Design a protein around this ligand. Structure first.
Ligand SMILES: *C(=O)[C@@H](NC(=O)[C@H](NN1CCN(CC)C(=O)C1=O)c1ccccc1)[C@@H]1N[C@@H](C(=O)O)C(C)(C)S1
Ligand SMILES: *C(=O)[C@@H](NC(=O)[C@H](NN1CCN(CC)C(=O)C1=O)c1ccccc1)[C@@H]1N[C@@H](C(=O)O)C(C)(C)S1
Lengths: 433, 438
């Protein structure tokens, strides 16, 4: 075997690596180092969600956002509620929702009579995603040290940002972060400080109450369209029986999976995860339901998980526990079954695209243009799961998990130079073996 | 050295161990297995906090909770504001807040003219905001009656002494629907809790333990209930200014002093005490409102001047709850030695739990038999997947052994099953026997 222990010698002190590689042609493990330890997979977890979506959902699957009602359309009139059905489209734009609201005119509706009803069916992303569910505020931090920073909320966001962030007397642009606590109805409170800065800038934020964010946005929207709504907003817990008035469809599975994999989009992963459960189980979907359904389905294919912990679709969670060799095994299922699944194309490509176009240790020959890999990142965690071709035109699957990687403070993640030297030498050896 | 690697074959497949042990008497490391891998320490991290506290706080430290006023006591009235000062006391009870306020009566006060001003400076109940204002651990009990037929709505019972509101519409699910239920708790503003989902029919009373989210509101409402029951009149505003508040000291509650606080934190692993002390340490050492990041810098720095070297450890908290903690066993070991070497001045040895006698190891299966029982002392750490010990024992030749044991990655089941400890019990029984006999 390759000598991995030699390589980890220059990863920072105290880190741990889990590395394993199999030459698919020769049917032979050619590297195997802590191959069996459970570690944090981070975004390499999406490999599993990919394969599970393929199997349980299929290529024709699409996310559906839908307008409905039981009311009789009268003259301009809608004599019932407007139920708006959200099913976790991770892709939905403000743009597209508006367009869906438009089908209400073309059908003659001037005035909606009853209430606005919002329907959900999953139990960072939710039923109602709009524009990646996030926003920004405008900070002006060109003030005196010790003096309040001016903050604005673009008018297009139904958000409050209160609290008060003073300027950092550089006597302390060390002892300083920015505390953000959320309150009922997307009211965000801010505290602490920043360092003096000349230009104006943007702080991005996740939307916490997405239900409410989406009912607010919809109401701006019926107004801009001249549809008179005067009712309440109901957020029932049950599916809402109504009559299909109109619908909006996401791009389909292969594009969704292409974006997830190449780019490492968490929301696609974690909505797909849950969509997988909703379909396998035919009922509202938790993350737990998602674990059950994704293990069960990969298990019908002969993937053995042991006591692996698969806590989400994207691998963000610090409770995920899986061993290289189980990741390794899912890859080989991918290669073997490529003819049918077409998952090989989704992996980013070294020095060419997705999350590893510029990846330091991969952008020379013979790895540039050769090594494809789903990457994974957290603070202290740098992973690669994927494939390459060696000196004989042979195929090689691998899995590199690195955890507890640490060289610096809360003030910043320090140098990646050991990572880059590690991966370089690592993949060079796999090539050459 | 001990072949720890063979003992690990007894742990569940997947798990990782870090083990290191020094025989202090000889100055010999006698086990060194991943001695240098950073791992999750869990509650053993209160070992760092305990030493930093002895050194910066000192044995005469007490937390203060205090009444102050700018007013004057005249003719039956405090003419001015009631200031109530909270500084993180994690043991404060409703009852002691009560007597503290009753000192107001005793002092002539049957009505206050000004407002109530609170002053600061820093789902379930194990984590719990160790906040400036703690009352009854910031923790309350609801009771769910789900002894009812499939279909029915679960009765929620809040005891009346809690100023909170639990609400919602949980229903009882038939045993078909039953395994698919989620019960959850959505936290709304000003201590209002919404519980949704269902559970299976239940045949005892189901309890919820909630952590209070808005501790400042919580305390203010309580203080008002207590002024009313005391027959002190008050009609003013409840103000929460964020800066320290001036006033003449009218009265002051003091907690038990540090040795008690430490004995309880070490023996029983109290998270609140650890996270409270972690911050008092910052306040006192830097003299400034204190946060977790300040706690981190101060503990690191206090220990550093004593010779402890942290390298790139991450100490995210005083209690070790956080899963961002990273520290290498060998680093834990040097604190242990430092603790055994300066025992004459620190007296931390007696705070350690005692195999089969007390604390969180009085019933620890891998330690219940001789020669470990009454010999091994050790701080435990536990989280889902983590099972650690940090302590000392006397070996067969009667010399002192200091050890550290980190186990992470421990999984024997579905993510919400009762973990099986039999592998753990085995591995510990064997490891400690090796350290004893070595
Ligand atoms: C998968 O590994 C993804 N990584 C991240 O999302 C990671 N995100 N985090 C880490 C910390 N937390 C805790 C609350 C987050 O909010 C959070 O979302 C992250 C994000 C930015 C920079 C570093 C790490 C995705 N995959 C990664 C990859 O390497 O493929 C990214 C960087 C593309 S994100
Ligand atoms: C230190 O290790 C302490 N462990 C825990 O509190 C621990 N886990 N918790 C409580 C806090 N949260 C907040 C989200 C958790 O999710 C969580 O894991 C715990 C609590 C109860 C049961 C098991 C683990 C204390 N030390 C432990 C020890 O072994 O000495 C305990 C179990 C005595 S608690």
């Amino acid at each position: 075997m390759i000598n991995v222990s030699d390589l980890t010698q220059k990863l920072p002190e105290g880190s741990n690596a889990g590395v394993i590689a199999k030459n698919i042609n020769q049917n032979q493990i050619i590297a195997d180092y802590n191959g069996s330890t459970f570690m944090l997979p981070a975004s390499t977890q999406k490999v599993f969600t990919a394969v599970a979506a393929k199997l349980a959902l299929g290529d024709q699957f699409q996310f559906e956002t839908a307008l409905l009602s039981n009311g009789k359309i009268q003259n301009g009139n809608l004599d019932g509620n407007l139920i708006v059905s959200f099913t976790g489209d991770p892709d939905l734009t403000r743009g597209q929702l508006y367009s869906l609201l438009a089908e209400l005119k073309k059908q003659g509706i001037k005035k909606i009579n009853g209430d606005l009803v919002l329907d959900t069916s999953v139990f960072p992303p939710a039923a109602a995603n709009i524009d990646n569910n996030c926003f920004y505020a405008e900070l002006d931090a060109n003030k005196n040290p010790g003096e309040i920073v001016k903050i604005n909320v673009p008018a297009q966001f139904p958000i409050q940002v209160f609290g008060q962030v003073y300027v950092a007397d550089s006597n302390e642009a060390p002892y300083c972060q920015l505390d953000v606590v959320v309150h009922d109805n997307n009211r965000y409170q801010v505290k602490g400080c920043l360092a003096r800065q000349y230009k104006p800038f943007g702080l991005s934020f996740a939307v916490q109450n997405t239900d409410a964010y989406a009912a607010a946005i919809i109401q701006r929207q019926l107004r801009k369209l001249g549809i008179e709504f005067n009712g309440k907003v109901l957020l029932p817990q049950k599916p809402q029986q109504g009559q299909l008035l109109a619908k909006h469809l996401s791009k389909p599975l292969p594009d969704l999976l292409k974006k997830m994999m190449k780019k490492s989009d968490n929301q696609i992963a974690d909505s797909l995860f849950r969509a997988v459960a909703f379909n396998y189980y035919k009922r509202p979907a938790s993350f737990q339901l998602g674990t059950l359904a994704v293990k069960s389905i990969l298990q019908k294919q002969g993937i053995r998980f042991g006591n692996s912990i698969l806590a989400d679709g994207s691998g963000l969670s610090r409770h995920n526990l899986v061993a290289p060799k189980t990741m390794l095994s899912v890859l080989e299922y991918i290669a073997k079954n490529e003819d049918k699944l077409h998952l090989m194309e989704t992996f980013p490509i070294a020095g060419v695209d997705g999350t590893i176009s510029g990846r330091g240790g991969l952008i020379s020959p013979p790895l540039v243009k050769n090594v494809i890999a789903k990457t994974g990142s957290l603070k202290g965690v740098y992973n690669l799961a994927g494939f390459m071709t060696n000196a004989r035109g042979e195929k090689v699957a691998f899995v590199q998990f690195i955890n507890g990687y640490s060289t610096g403070d809360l003030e910043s993640k320090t140098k990646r130079a050991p990572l880059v030297q590690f991966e370089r030498n690592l993949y060079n050896e796999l090539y050459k073996y």
